[PDB]
Write a structure and sequence with these properties.
By secondary structure, the chain is an alpha+beta fold. It has 2 domains: 129 residues, Poly(ADP-ribose) polymerase, regulatory domain (Poly(ADP-ribose) Polymerase, domain 1, Up-down Bundle); 215 residues, Phosphoenolpyruvate Carboxykinase, domain 3 (Alpha-Beta Complex). Helix content is 32%, strand content 21%. The strands form 4 sheets. The protein has a 5-stranded antiparallel β-sheet, with helices on both faces. A 4-stranded mixed β-sheet has the order 4-12-7-6, with no helix packed on it. A hairpin with a 2-residue loop joins strand 9 and strand 10. The chain is globular. It starts with 5 loop residues before the first helix and ends with a strand. 39% of the residues are buried. Keywords: Acetylation, ADP-ribosylation, Allosteric enzyme, Chromosome, DNA damage, DNA repair, DNA-binding, Glycosyltransferase, NAD, Nucleotidyltransferase, Nucleus, Phosphoprotein, Transferase. Component of a base excision repair (BER) complex, containing at least XRCC1, PARP1, POLB and LRIG3. Homo- and heterodimer with PARP1. Interacts (via the PARP catalytic domain) with HPF1. Interacts with core nucleosomes. It is found in: Nucleus; Chromosome.
Length: 345
């Protein structure tokens, strides 16, 4: 047996659970039976990404014929889906590419998590993370602020639930402090959400960019790292349910520097930086600078969401801001919130 504060123990038991990992993939229509997760290799994943590209190639060239059909078959073979008896859908839209990209991303973290769950077990894992998780003093000013930011930036559009801050752990990933690069302006504390089973991979490898094999059009603003100034915008990525009532969302410092403001999506946005250090999807609603506060050197956009005045002259107007940096060194994980979702029914 071994010891770590009970909170850190709870947290690990939550994100290390192999069952939940299985559950998550199944819930994503992934065939764990015909393709056991325990046998999933990093090479297989890279294979899937390439199949998608080929599919993106067809969609790109308007080839919705045999060319496409063969590409999907290849991919569905590479990444087995469980549709029961139903006939698999022929991927032929960007939105769907985007979903399959998120599936491969999850598999990538499952691969990582398992390759890590191999001297008390939890204590052993905590080490393998090379990431410090010190529980936070629920009386600290940090806590009060994290809580205020969390609630004050819960977007109106997301009322199908409520959030109760169970606990907060301060994160300290090896090497981020040093590499962070404090020279850039717009140093913000932003949200980032993800499913439970993803957290082991995020903690050990940190948040990272999409692979070069991946289809570019499966990324709203290119292969970068995404953040939001609205707690709920991110919490939706937890895909927590009434049974999976507990989820985790991360809060980290992002050196935005000069932002290249964009009204609408663009997978190729990274190319348009030309000096600016990040892309900003201009949302129709966001915190007001007048309500900003500073915490340990980073600006906290907590002010209740207000109208920004942005309005696409012809087209869809993004609801909330979208932030993207294309280099890990522009990110430094700080706090990891343990949240309990209270749905309505």
């Amino acid at each position: 047996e071994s010891q770590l504060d009970l909170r850190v123990q709870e947290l690990l038991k939550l994100i290390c659970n192999v069952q939940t990992m299985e559950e998550m993939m199944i819930e994503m229509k992934y065939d764990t039976k015909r393709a056991p997760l325990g046998k999933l290799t990093v090479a297989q994943i890279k294979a899937g990404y390439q199949s998608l590209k080929k599919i993106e190639d067809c969609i790109r060239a308007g080839q919705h014929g045999r060319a496409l059909v063969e590409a999907c078959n290849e991919f569905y073979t590479r990444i087995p889906h469980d549709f029961g008896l139903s006939i698999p859908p022929v991927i032929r839209t960007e939105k769907e590419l985007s979903d399959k990209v998120k599936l491969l991303e999850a598999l990538g973290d499952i691969e990582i998590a398992l390759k890590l769950v191999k001297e008390h077990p939890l204590d052993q894992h905590y080490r393998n993370l090379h990431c410090a998780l010190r529980p936070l003093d629920h009386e600290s000013n940090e806590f009060k602020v994290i809580s205020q930011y969390l609630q004050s930036t819960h977007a109106p559009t997301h009322k199908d639930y409520t959030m109760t801050l169970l606990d907060v752990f301060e994160v300290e990933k090896e090497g981020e402090k040093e590499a962070f690069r404090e020279d850039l302006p717009n140093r913000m504390l932003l949200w980032h959400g993800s499913r439970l089973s993803n957290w082991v991979g995020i903690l050990s490898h940190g948040l990272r960019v999409a692979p070069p094999e991946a289809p570019i059009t499966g990324y709203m603003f290119g292969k970068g790292i995404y953040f939001a100034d609205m707690s709920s915008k991110s919490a939706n990525y937890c895909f927590a349910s009434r049974l999976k009532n507990t989820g985790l969302l991360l809060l980290s410092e992002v050196a935005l520097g000069q932002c290249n403001e964009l009204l609408e999506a663009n997978p190729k946005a990274q190319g348009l930086l030309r000096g600016k250090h990040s892309t900003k999807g201009m949302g129709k609603m966001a915190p007001s600078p007048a309500h900003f506060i500073t915490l340990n050197g980073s600006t906290v956009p907590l002010g209740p969401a207000s109208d920004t005045g942005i309005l696409n002259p012809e087209g869809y107007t993004l609801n909330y801001n979208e932030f993207i940096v294309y280099s890990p060194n522009q990110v430094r994980m700080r706090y990891l919130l343990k949240i309990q979702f209270n749905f309505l029914q």
